């Protein structure tokens, strides 16, 4: 048998793929539960549980034919029941009943669903998902969505068996392998907190022929032993290893692996800093008085202040802390929407956003949003913005310096160097009599409960947050909706709760942002629609409510995985997340071999995508 061995860092809060919007859950369930469609190696959307599908000529009705040989299994591998179309009716109703955190993906798209979720109706037979027979699911939409099929790669549209769901009650989806059923490539054999995630190939999976590893073992990695990755790889214990050029170890490693260091491409997951606009929890702070806390509360609502932070934040120095001097810029991402995520009459989205920035102020003149460079850092612009902020804020009684708390895990040595760099650059440019970045080193429980796994905005315990978004479907709105005041998935990280915008949301203009989103969403012509979302992204950059930082990818590794064997997806959770298709080999891949494989994949991908787009028309009813 063959085995993939590496590491993981995020324990899931649950396995509830219908209720969670955290990647800590979907990164796991991607390997355990299939939906209607999935990805091939080229980012095409291809059959999964659905062997075929059609869309009506008006674009409102999608019908899917489920393959007859797909079954549910228990975590121990026993057969439970065949997958049926009713499981998709059950899944959507459960997501609605449980108020899933990812409901924005469907609540405004599926006919009747918003009425059902909000209690206007009580009858799920009025909602636009139907099992026409055991093999046929039909969805009915409120308006056409060319990106609807890409949404089926997100877990809120995955199926669940109603008898299992009822049998399990509130035990369904807990962090225990027996809490869900399995119809995907793997069964979950071990899920041990701060220790291990282990998968075993399901030999009875409908597509077992495309699963080339029999075992996947992930060891918990808390960040305190970055050298262990290469150490275990060289000892034959890991299949891959991320390299850390800053380390004292790197000298000899690059000697030993001169011809094996491989750099990945930057991908569509985007990270950014944001501010806590309505902080309620001060368990982790270096502020000693209520006047300091109210001063920071006022500062983060001031646009000039946020812009000053933005221009003072040296992205190159930050990237260098994990990538080294040479590679510091390889991970930089300057928009939330990746610059080539869509195009508008051949022009990349990011070049359209760039063309719209000077309109928002002359401080943006010449800005370039391409990946892999820092267009923000500018000490003279930062100091000028801060001087205007300070006059506005001082008149409100605000006291300086403004203290900003940033958390980091105490074991996360590389992360600690990263946040140290942000402290150094901001304070160097603006002056530590004006701004102080207070780093709070937290235990795992402290770090989880104050940030990523906090369950309410009031529990967020920081002034500055560094999080990110992985796209759920193929449209700029997957990213840009996350700050909307009605239902934005990233509102709680800004200290705001979805619902009516409060005075702090209105102070920073997120109500206007939300109205812009609603108007852009009405556009169905892709070029016009994307241009409206480009305006929205430009507004957001100018607001400096996010400070774009880095992407995933762009990092050095050693590898015994086969290049470009795994699925790839621009959006959704059935590409790199899945260990289906992935292959392992005996030879450590060389840089030259990887580059030859990459150029081959890049060329095949364009050809493959063009044929996939031609195939689309055959599916129109």
């Amino acid at each position: 048998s063959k085995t993939y061995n590496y590491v993981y860092s995020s324990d899931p809060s649950s396995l509830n793929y219908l209720a969670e919007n955290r990647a800590a859950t979907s990164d796991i369930v991607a390997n355990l539960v299939d939906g209607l469609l999935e990805n091939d190696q080229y980012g095409n959307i291809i059959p999964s549980l659905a062997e075929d599908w059609t869309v009506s000529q008006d674009g409102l009705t999608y019908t899917y034919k489920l393959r007859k040989d797909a079954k549910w299994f228990t975590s121990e591998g026993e057969e439970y029941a065949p997958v049926t179309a009713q499981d998709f009716v059950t899944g959507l109703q459960y997501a609605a009943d449980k108020k899933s955190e990812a409901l924005y993906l469907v609540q405004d798209s599926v006919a009747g669903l918003d009425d059902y979720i909000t209690g206007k109706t009580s009858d799920f037979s009025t909602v636009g998902v139907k099992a026409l027979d055991d093999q046929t699911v039909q969805y009915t939409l409120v308006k056409p969505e060319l990106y609807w099929n890409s949404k089926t790669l997100a877990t809120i549209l995955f199926p669940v068996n109603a008898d299992f769901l009822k049998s399990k009650g509130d035990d369904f989806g807990k962090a225990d392998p027996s809490s869900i059923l399995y119809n995907g490539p793997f069964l979950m054999k071990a899920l041990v907190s701060k220790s291990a995630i282990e998968y075993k190939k399901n030999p009875n999976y409908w597509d077992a022929k495309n699963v080339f590893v029999d075992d996947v073992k992930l060891t918990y990695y808390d960040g305190s032993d970055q050298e262990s990755l290469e150490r275990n790889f060289t000892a034959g214990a890991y299949t891959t290893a991320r390299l850390f050029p800053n380390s004292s170890s790197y000298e000899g490693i690059k000697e030993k692996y001169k011809n094996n260091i491989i750099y990945s491409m930057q991908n569509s997951t985007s990270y950014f800093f944001n501010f806590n606009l309505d902080r309620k929890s001060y368990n982790y702070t270096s502020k000693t008085s209520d006047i300091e806390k109210k001063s920071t509360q006022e500062a983060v609502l001031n646009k000039n202040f946020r812009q000053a932070i933005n221009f003072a934040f040296d992205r190159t120095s930050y990237g260098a802390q994990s990538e080294g001097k040479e590679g510091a810029t390889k991970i930089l991402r300057n928009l939330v929407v990746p610059p080539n995520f869509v195009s508008i009459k051949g022009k990349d989205f990011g070049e359209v956003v760039a063309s719209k920035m000077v309109n928002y102020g002359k401080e943006w003149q010449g800005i370039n949003f391409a990946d892999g460079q820092d267009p923000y850092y500018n000490p003279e612009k930062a100091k000028a913005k801060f001087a205007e902020a300070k006059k506005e804020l001082e008149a409100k009684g605000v006291q300086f310096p403004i203290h900003l708390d940033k958390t980091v895990e105490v074991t996360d040595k590389v992360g600690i160097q990263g946040v140290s760099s942000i402290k150094q650059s901001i304070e160097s440019v603006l002056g530590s009599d004006n701004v102080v970045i207070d780093i709070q080193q937290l235990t795992s429980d402290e770090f989880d409960s104050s940030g990523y796994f906090a369950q309410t905005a009031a529990q967020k315990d920081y002034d500055l947050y560094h999080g990110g978004w992985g796209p759920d479907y193929q449209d700029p709105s997957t990213y840009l909706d996350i700050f909307n005041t009605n239902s934005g998935g990233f509102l709680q990280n800004l200290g705001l709760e979805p619902g009516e915008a409060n005075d702090k949301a209105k102070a920073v203009g997120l109500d206007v942002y939300t109205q812009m989103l609603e108007e852009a969403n009405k556009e169905q012509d892709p070029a016009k629609r994307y241009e409206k979302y480009a305006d929205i992204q430009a507004w957001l950059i100018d607001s400096s409510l996010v400070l774009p930082s880095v992407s995933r990818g762009g990092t050095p590794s050693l590898r015994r995985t086969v290049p470009f064997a795994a699925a790839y997806g621009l959006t959704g959770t059935k590409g790199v997340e899945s260990y289906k298709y992935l292959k392992v080999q005996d030879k450590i891949v060389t840089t030259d071999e990887y580059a030859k494989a990459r150029e081959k994949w890049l060329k095949e991908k364009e050809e493959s995508n063009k044929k996939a787009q031609e195939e689309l028309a055959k599916h129109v009813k």
């Binding site: 590491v7 860092s9 995020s10 969670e20 919007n21 955290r22 990647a23 800590a24 979907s26 990812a102 997100a154 990695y221 960040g223 970055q226 990755l229 991320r242 997951t269 990270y271 930050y318 994990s322 991970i331 980091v408 895990e409 996360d412 590389v414 992360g415 600690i416 990263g418 946040v419 940030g451 990523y452 560094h466 999080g467 990110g468 978004w469 992985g470 759920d472 998935g489 990233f490 990280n493 930082s549 880095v550 992407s551 995933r552 990818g553 990092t555 959770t573």
Partner: peptide
């Protein structure tokens, strides 16, 4: 979905 983990795009 929401992505977290360590600091930035950390392991």
């Amino acid at each position: 979905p929401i992505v977290g983990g360590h600091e930035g795009a950390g392991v």
